[PDB]
Amino acid sequence: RSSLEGIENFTWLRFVDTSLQEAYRASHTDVFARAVDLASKQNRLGHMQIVYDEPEDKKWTPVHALFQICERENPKAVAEITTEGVLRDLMNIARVKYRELGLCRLEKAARPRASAPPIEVVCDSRSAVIERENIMFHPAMR
Amino acid sequence: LIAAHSHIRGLGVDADTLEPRPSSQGLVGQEKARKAAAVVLEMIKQGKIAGRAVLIAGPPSTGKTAIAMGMAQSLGQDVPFTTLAASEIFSLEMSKTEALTQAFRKSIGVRIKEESEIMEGEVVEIQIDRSVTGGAKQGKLTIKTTDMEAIYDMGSKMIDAMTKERVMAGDIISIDKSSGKITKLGRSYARSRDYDAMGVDTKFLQCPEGELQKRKEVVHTVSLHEIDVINSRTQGFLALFSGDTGEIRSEIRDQINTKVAEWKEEGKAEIVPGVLFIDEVHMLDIECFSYINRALESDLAPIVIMASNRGVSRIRGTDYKSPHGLPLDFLDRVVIINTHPYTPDELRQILSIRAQEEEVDLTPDALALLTKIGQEAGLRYASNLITTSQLIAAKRRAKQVGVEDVQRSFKLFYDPARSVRFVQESEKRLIGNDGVVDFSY
Amino acid sequence: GLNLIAAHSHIRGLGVDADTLEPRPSSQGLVGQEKARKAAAVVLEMIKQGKIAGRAVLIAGPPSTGKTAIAMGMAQSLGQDVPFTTLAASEIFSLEMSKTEALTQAFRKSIGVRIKEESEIMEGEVVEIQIDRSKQGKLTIKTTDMEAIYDMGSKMIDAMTKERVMAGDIISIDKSSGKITKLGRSYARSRDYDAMGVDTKFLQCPEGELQKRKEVVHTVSLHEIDVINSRTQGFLALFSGDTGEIRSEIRDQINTKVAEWKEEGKAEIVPGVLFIDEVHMLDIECFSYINRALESDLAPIVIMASNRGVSRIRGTDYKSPHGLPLDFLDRVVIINTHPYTPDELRQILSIRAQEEEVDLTPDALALLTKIGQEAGLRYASNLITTSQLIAAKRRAKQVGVEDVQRSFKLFYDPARSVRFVQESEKRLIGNDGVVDFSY
Amino acid sequence: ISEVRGNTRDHRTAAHTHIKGLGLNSSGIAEKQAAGFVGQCAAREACGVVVDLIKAHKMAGRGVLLAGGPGTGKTALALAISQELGTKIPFCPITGSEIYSTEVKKTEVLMENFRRAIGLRVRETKDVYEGEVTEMTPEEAENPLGGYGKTISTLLIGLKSARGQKKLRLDPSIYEAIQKERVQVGDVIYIETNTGACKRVGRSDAYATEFDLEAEEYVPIPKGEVHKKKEIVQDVTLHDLDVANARPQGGQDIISMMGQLMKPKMTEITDKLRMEINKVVQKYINQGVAELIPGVLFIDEAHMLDIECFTYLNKALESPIAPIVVLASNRGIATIRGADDLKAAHGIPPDFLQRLLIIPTHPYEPDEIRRIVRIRAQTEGVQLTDAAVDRVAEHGVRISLRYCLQLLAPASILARVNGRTQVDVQDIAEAEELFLDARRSANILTSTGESGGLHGFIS
Amino acid sequence: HRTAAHTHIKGLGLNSSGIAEKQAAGFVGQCAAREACGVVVDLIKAHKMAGRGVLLAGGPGTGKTALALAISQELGTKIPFCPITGSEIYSTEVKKTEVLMENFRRAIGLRVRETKDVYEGEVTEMTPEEASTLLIGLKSARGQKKLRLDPSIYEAIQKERVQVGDVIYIETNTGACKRVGRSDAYATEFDLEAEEYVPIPKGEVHKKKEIVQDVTLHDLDVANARPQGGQDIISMMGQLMKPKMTEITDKLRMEINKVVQKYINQGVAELIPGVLFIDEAHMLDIECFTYLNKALESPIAPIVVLASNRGIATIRGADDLKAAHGIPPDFLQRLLIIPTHPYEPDEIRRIVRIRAQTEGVQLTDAAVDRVAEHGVRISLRYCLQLLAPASILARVNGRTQVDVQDIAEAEELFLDARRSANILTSTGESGGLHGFIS
Ligand SMILES: Nc1ncnc2c1ncn2[C@@H]1O[C@H](COP(=O)(O)OP(=O)(O)O)[C@@H](O)[C@H]1O
Ligand SMILES: Nc1ncnc2c1ncn2[C@@H]1O[C@H](COP(=O)(O)OP(=O)(O)O)[C@@H](O)[C@H]1O
Ligand SMILES: Nc1ncnc2c1ncn2[C@@H]1O[C@H](COP(=O)(O)OP(=O)(O)O)[C@@H](O)[C@H]1O
Ligand SMILES: Nc1ncnc2c1ncn2[C@@H]1O[C@H](COP(=O)(O)OP(=O)(O)O)[C@@H](O)[C@H]1O
DSSP states (O other): OOOOSSSSSSGGGGGSSOOHHHHHHTTTTTOOOOOOOHHOOOOOOHHHHHOOOTTTTTTTOGGTTTTTTTHSOOOHHHHHHHHSSSHHTTTTTTHHHHHHHTTTTTTSSSSSSOOOOOOEEEEEEHHHHHHHHHHHOOTTTO | OTTTTOOSSSSOTTTTOBBBEEEEETEEOHHHHHHHHHHHHHHHHHHOOOOOOOEEEOOSTTTTTHHHHHHHHHHHSOOOOOEEEEEOOSSSSSSSHHHHHHHHHHEEEEEEEEEEEEEEEEEEEEEEETTTTTSEEEEEEEOOOSEEEOOOOOOOEEEEHHHHHTTOEEEEEEETTTTOEEEEEESSOOOSSSSSSOOOOOOOOOOOOOOSEEEEEEEEEEEEHHHHHHHHHHSSSTTHHHHHOOOOHHHHHHHHHHHHHHHHHTTTTEEEEEEEEEEEGGGGGGGHHHHHHHHSSSTTTEEEEEEEESEEOHHHHHHHSEEEOOOOOHHTTTEEEOOOOOHHHHHHHHHHHHHHHTTOOOOHHHHHHHHHHHHOOOOHHHHHHHHHHHHHHHTTTTTSOOHHHHHHHHHHOHHHHHHHHHHHHHTTTSSTOOOOOOOOO | SSSOOOOOTTSSOBBTTTOOBBOOOOEEESSSSHHHHHHHHHHHHHHOOOOOOOOOOEEEHHHHHHEEEEEEHHHHHHOOSSOEEEEGGGGGSSSSHHHHHHHHHHHHTEEEEEEEEEEEEEEEOOOOOEOOOOOOOEEEOOOOOOOEEEEHHHHHHHHHHTOOTTTEEEEEEEETTTOOEEEEEGGGGSSSOBBBTOOOOEEEOOOSEEEOOOOOEEEEEHHHHHHHHHSSSSHHHHHHHHOOOHHHHHHHHHHHHHHHHHHHEEEEEEEEEEETTTTTSBBBHHHHHHHHSSSTTTTTTTEEEEEBBBEEOBBBEEEEETTTHHHHHTTTTEOOOOOHHHHHHHHHHHHHHHHOOBBHHHHHHHHHHHHHHHHHHHHHHHHHHHHHHHHHOOOOOTTOOHHHHHHHHHOOHHHHHHHHHHHHHGGGGGGOOOOOOOO | OOOOOOOOOOBOOTTTTTOOSSSEEEETTTTTTETTTTTTTHHHHHHHHHHHHHHHHTSSSOEEEEEETSSSSSHHHHHHHHHHHOOOOOOEEEEGGGHHHHHSSSHHHHHHHHHHHHEEEEEEEEEEEEEEEEEEEEOOOOOOTTTSOOOEEEEEEEEEEEEEEEEEOOOOHHHHHHHHOOOOTTTEEEEETTOOOEEEEEEEETHHHHHHSSOOOOOOOSSSOOOEEEEEEEEEHHHHHHHHHHHHOOSSHHHHHHTTTSSSOOOOOOHHHHHHHHHHHHHHHHHHHOOOOOOOEEEEEEGGGGGGHHHHHHHTSSSSSEEEEEEEEESSEEEEEEEEEEEEEEOHHHHHHTTEEEEOOOOOOOHHHHHHHHHHHHHHHHOOOOHHHHHHHHHHHHHHHHHHHHHHHHHHHHHTTTTOOOOHHHHHHHHHHHHHHHHHHHHHHHHHHHHHOOOOOBB | OOTTTTTTTOOOOOTTTSOOOSSSTTTTTTTTHHHHHHHHHHHHHHOOOOOOOOEEOTTSSSSSHHHHHHHHSSTTTSOOEEEETTTTTOOOSHHHHHHHHHHHTEEEEEEEEEEEEEEEEEEEEEEEOOOOOEEEEEEETTEEEEEEEEEHHHHHHHTTTTOOOOOEETTTTTTEEEEEEEEEGGGSSSSSOOEEEEEOOOOSSSSEEEEEEEEHHHHHHHHHSSSGGGGGOOGGGOGSOOOOOOOOOHHHHHHHHHHHHHHTTHHHHHHHHOOOEEEGGGSHHHHHHHHHHHTTSSOOOOOEEEEEBEEEEEEBTTTEEEEETOOEEEEEEEOOEEEEOOOOOHHHHHHHHHHHHHOOOOOOHHHHOOOHHHHHHHHHHHHHHHHHHHHHHHHHHTSSSBBBHHHHHHHHHHHOOOOOOHHHHHTTSSSTTTTOOO
16 A cells, blocks of 8 residues: 555556455465455456447446456457357367367276375374375365 | 469379379379379378388479378378478477377377267257256256157256257257267247347258157277377366377377277277378487387388488588488488479479469460579479469459569569579678678668 | 665766756766766657657767766656666576567566546544344444444445454445455554454554545556456566566557557556666677567667677677677667766765765875776775775774775785786686696 | 546657558559658569568468668568558568577467468357346246246346337346346346346446445446447457467366466467368358458568578468568578578578568668658658758768668757757757767777777777 | 584684784684775675675685685674575576575565564463454463454464363464464373373463564565465475466565565664675676676675686686686676685694694694695695594594504595596506596
8 A cells, every 4th residue: 555656566556456455365375265266256347348349338447447458358258249159169179179079088098007195294293183184185175 | 272282182193003194183293203102102091011211302392392292182181191390399398209209199090980879859848957056957858859759857067058059949959969069950930029139040940850869870080199198187188289288108108009909909990090291301300310210110100201302411410411411320211202303394384283273364475484484593483473473464454464474573573593693792781691781872 | 774875876867957958077976978978868858758769879888987877867867757677688588488578578668658547545444333134234434533434235244244344443445446455453452452363463543534535646567567467467477577478469459558548548658768788798689679679669768888899799609899780780879988087086986985975085085096097996986985994993083095005905906806817827727727726 | 537638649750650651653663752762662562562462362371581781671661561451461570589489489489470460350240138227027927837836937127228228028047147147226237149148247337326335346337229239340360269279268167267377378289279270260261251361470580580490481381371471681691590501692591592582672872861861850850951961861871871860869859959940960960979870989999999908898 | 513614714813903813713814815804894794885796816725715704703693694606596497697686685684673472371261252352261380361362363273273171372473373282181081082182381371582583685575476385285286386486576676675664664673784605706607797787786785795716717608708717807897806815834734733623633743744744735625634534543543643644544545636636647548448437
């Protein structure tokens, strides 16, 4: 909050859609925890691309999302709404033909000859046993 | 579009005698080389013999790539023909050896057959049950022919497909029961009127006849490389396409080689060995050649065809020269085809094919002048002037390319030799190898 | 403070008449270099006027001739208002990205996008949250100067719940986004608990009106907008680095939209400066890229400095002046900085002594000026700090000549050092590794 | 929110802002000076045929070389070609130096730009219903299902836009979208007819005053018709299809979502993917639903490409789908950047040079330099006395064209700070003394750096 | 304790006036170079000046590294001394200019005086107060105490599996807490349980102690660049996820300087600029010196001390340029240069005696003579390496002290490189079966 104006290093945070709380969270949570947070969010800037089309709409964008240019303008959103799925199919070529080749159903031709569980610390203490369960069987990730 | 070799539609040989015709299927001349390539092409088709390295050699132009492109057209789509530029091998994601291993294994097909089973019928009714707050879904499809009705239970994956396809009663659908894909074929009912946003009033179809289930034999061809990628991984099979695949471990390949042999013995698969064409093969390192030479020796090696423009030339990654720029103990394993520069009537015939492929109506004197240019500037330059003179002729609305258009094109665009003289005539004003230059008048 | 005294701390501006651009013999810390300062002032005029895109100016001269000092003075005189990217050429040899990406980024850093915004932010200490279900609720906030009750919507009560807002917390609500932030707790609650968690901090209560409508000006680099669009939370890469060779089609979109903002008047484009120091450490592939980079509407003015004579260009084996390609030098205008006269040295050494708060005696400053003539500006400059410390060791009031003499005795200049290296060559590792360790 | 600046708009001037086209007659003959060009009548006429080559869709994989010394307008000619094509045709400029990525092999970097230069134009119809939700109302069914007690046969939704409102009768299955999406009266939504689902943009800003605090931003009522049926034309490059297939963007799993939180590292896109993309593209072209629109890959300082780049370009140019490649070079006879034993003209391997249409660019006469000075002055807005013009042109003959174009702005500063609304000889004679050329500077080096020394240049 | 090479160097041995004593603090000679290093110590301790460069220049074995480690001990433990070699910067993770930046900031310290309130006791009560606050009761052998816990420190106590009867450690101000174990008053709650039983804490349940914490500006960089420690558990996957170095932006380092100065203005933190010492600076290349040239102009930069033993030598990365010290003349102008000279025979004798008594070796006078002779005729480093072997040989002869016999044996078991080169010249005369490989 002391660096949020002018030439100060967080000047841009008004126009990136994150709040100060979201910035502080994303700087402290790891990539997995941040990815779980992403699962909750709605790609509302992609829906705006469908609605705020016209010259009267001025390609409207909420000013606090001004710098999310590539989210507000992206063919991916439009190709999913057009009824002739032409560009929609052109964007799924790889996943379709992989499946059409039957590679998803063909028997496995190889597998690892040996398999093992992770190596573990062995320590004669109860805190070690708790910390093993907290990390190697991590409940929130699980 | 029209590309450099788009007129090449085969090798132009009598299939019975392997005799090259002097002009057919778009190839001209090179009769000795075309017969040699036809013998290679036959032993490709026969499949019996593995690991033959054939080097096509010659000066620049003279059709070495054109011959290799004629071979590819004559094999058709079924036999693998992996084109590789030797500069593709210097990956940052994998070693040159791994990049070569993948290029070989891309050139061996596994042709796998399965009996799919398909359904096709009118949807009479759909029921879907959905758990509030997500999770489980359940449903039933009632589907009809002129001759059957049956009610099929549906799982989540099929209900996802049904709703993505927006299946409705009165649709004619087919279901590939083995892959699970659905296609709407049309509708037997009208589109209703009670609702809005129903979308497209798709094609009318009469109801399918016969039984709902039909078996369907289908055949798929996959490379040994494509089997490698999905068997070195649990997840991320897009590496078939994105190229994210790392250096695959040899244990996986050794297993796959064993199992693909067993699939052949079981009659599950046919192995269809094809061609790896390494163009510009002189661009490989000594380390690459000392890999190919022993990679060739395996039973699953493809037939490797190469082209080189090089004379007695330095081998990359070492201090010394060799013929073709290729190591002698590599060339020991190679049978060499030599292409020869064309005569004026061969030039004339090629330029006529280029003109016809580009649909350009040359006047006879323009073809004569283009032939004279072809003898002295080269076939590629004389080819470039055809499409250029067509455009210039269109500026003057000429119905045919006249001599004036070829002369106008010859004026505007320099050949290589004339450009070399232009460089020599302006050595003061071009940047030298010393980096010195004079900018003043 | 945390800014210590540095080599260019005395440089406070460019030192020219703002009307005529005529320099004066010293001001703002600079001494002499009048033509180079006048030329630098002419460049600073076209930087500030901004319409001339992509000029390149080379500051060329011997060591210790004020090339960096003039670049600092130009940056000071340009002020904070305009971007001034300062790049050592060594920084472009990144392992995480290609050299042309690293040059592209530095170019993008030097164009500002300026936006002015007003937005409603409500900040205060939470007094109570009240909730009813039958969803609705009420929020009481105080400043030092107000207390008010606000009706909260259902989504707002959820956000309060998700973020564990208690009484005594300081919260901010950006009404434009609707998002809550918790700044901390009021320091009045310092006695509310015996033990506090690691993520808790106390604050003074917000002051004045609860909801404020400040007008704020924002200037962001084009590089910042790139890195923000690089990936879903790309703004984090602005600090850790942690960014790829950004796709050109992203920059293509951003340039097109920034033009729309300038057409619509949402933003003002503020072209600034890139200063590439030691530009002779670039290679033939950098220079050939920079040619195209300069030739664009969104190119800054590029200043660069070199001290190289006729010297081999890097990434090749032929020599050229300044160590730069002539193909590149054709796109450049050159400012030449000269050596200094003893009277200009005498002034600079006085300016340094003042910035270092060292009281030279007149004889010490005279002797120190002789050393500057005989042994170079930087060496005599470095003796100022040394003589101050030696004087302090004898508790002297002023730096005398004896303190400069002892400084000169203890620390060799480069020429006297090179002589020592020549005199003892067998005791030192030669270029062929030979040495004798014996007496 | 943002405080819009009312002040007048203007354009920055760069080294090529004066160039506006090739300046040719309808006969294709170059006008002696036009569209910002002076001279180069041969090279402009050649580029005009190249322009008509590109606009004719027979071309695939042709090569052009712009050959000539530094300053001779090869960059200007490439930009003029680009302007003659205009924005509807891709022009993809790079230097050879940009191909040396750290992140993929350089043949991938070049094939990306090769496919960036190829455009695809896809026409589709967008078909939606769109508005603020004015009502939601269940239509109880005539024949309810036993054991449920509730059975709805239609859900009715009112949508309003700025331009109207409609009573919309929807299949009850939309309950799933509404309940997941949490649509409410006063929310702005669209219904897409290819699914019958709905998506929520936000709450209508007509309701922005419902509470003193609510935790969402509001969005304006859609300013279009309540029902949109529009053809939409999408600009696509084939490189966009490469990336969109090789790294799918929307995946909702943890590895996808972790992937999109980390830098989008380039990958060595397979030829198998590119060749299948081509086949599906050619299918849709034959359906007539898409146009292929090949454009221009322009590589400046192409002598910075090495022999591995050139040997790959042989294969690349032979592709049946390929842009035109235009190369510019100034390197005399020079060593090939990656084949130290081989020298060739233009620094281009003789193998590859035979493929290119070479276009030479020549030096400029003293009177052409003067005409360029006139064009450049009025473009930067500078105005000169004729004696200032002649002095600038004289330095252009003796030193370099570029150096003299670069004196205009400095002298304009010195004129205005001397109170003069036009630049005169006194200002040129002053700009030329503050701002040296490379030769006069090199003379200072050669005189001063004759030895080591305390004030010597370093070498 | 162990005896490394420099362990006899206790300091610079300067007079009150800053003149060097001819033998003091375990130095002999180098008086002019010790006095010059004394002024560098004053420069550092004044903490007025950024980014002054110093060069130590002189032959190998002339004490350049003794002098740098004497400075490090004149500065004491408070001031950060960051030693590297010029070869350490060729990291594979990040550009070498980033590695220099990280080492400049390791040389700048930041001191915080933190009062730690520790409560360690058996958990006698855990009473959730709200439905947020917890009350916890803790007991030692010497009384019990109640504490009001913020919901944050409560959930930390609750994320650890603390229960009544457990023994715990709490830091009141930091919010750190640890389960020390289960109190052994419950040791017979079962006859076997997978549990660790510990005695009740026998001191005060409350302790207050003041710890002068030191960090560095690089520590603040690393903490702010990425989630660290328990914030990033997925780091356990390695590969993409491990805590790689990244090329920190100067946006971050500038914004860190802002925050750090805020806490200096509050008086919470004390800034302590120190020293970056680079040995074998001739292993730096032209691009590194090009960066150092700029980086020394920043207002924070530490004092940099360089050592080189090269004569006129090619600079790395530009074989076209030969310079003294292997340092580019461009950059050499920026440095205060201290020459170190070779030692006299009498000085070698004194250094031998100093190190003998530092290894605990004791010598006859003739044993000192013979070792010192090898110091003069071969190398100071060689003769000092004789001392420890000769002590072993004397010990296994039962002798209390090393004598000529034990050195004359050591010098024949352990050759110098000079006699070894003579063996190579006599024996590697040809590529025969018993020849050395060429
Ligand atoms: N015998 C031929 N018949 C038809 N076209 C040919 C023949 N030889 C060469 N060409 C054409 O001339 C051009 C150059 O031939 P190419 O095969 O590419 O030479 P290179 O062997 O050097 O690759 C191509 O466009 C090719 O189609
Ligand atoms: N004209 C000047 N006035 C005042 N100080 C100067 C002047 N020129 C150089 N200095 C100072 O002398 C030192 C060396 O000059 P600098 O420009 O950094 O060297 P270089 O010429 O290598 O760029 C710096 O501390 C700089 O501040
Ligand atoms: N024929 C011309 N007419 C007008 N301006 C020109 C002409 N040729 C070059 N210029 C201008 O002069 C400068 C030199 O040309 P440029 O294309 O940069 O040379 P190069 O081909 O060596 O890159 C550019 O600013 C360009 O706009
Ligand atoms: N002046 C001195 N007085 C006492 N011992 C010294 C002195 N100089 C060096 N030494 C000892 O001899 C060893 C060799 O000196 P060293 O500093 O390693 O030389 P350099 O680092 O210049 O190669 C050191 O480890 C130190 O223990």
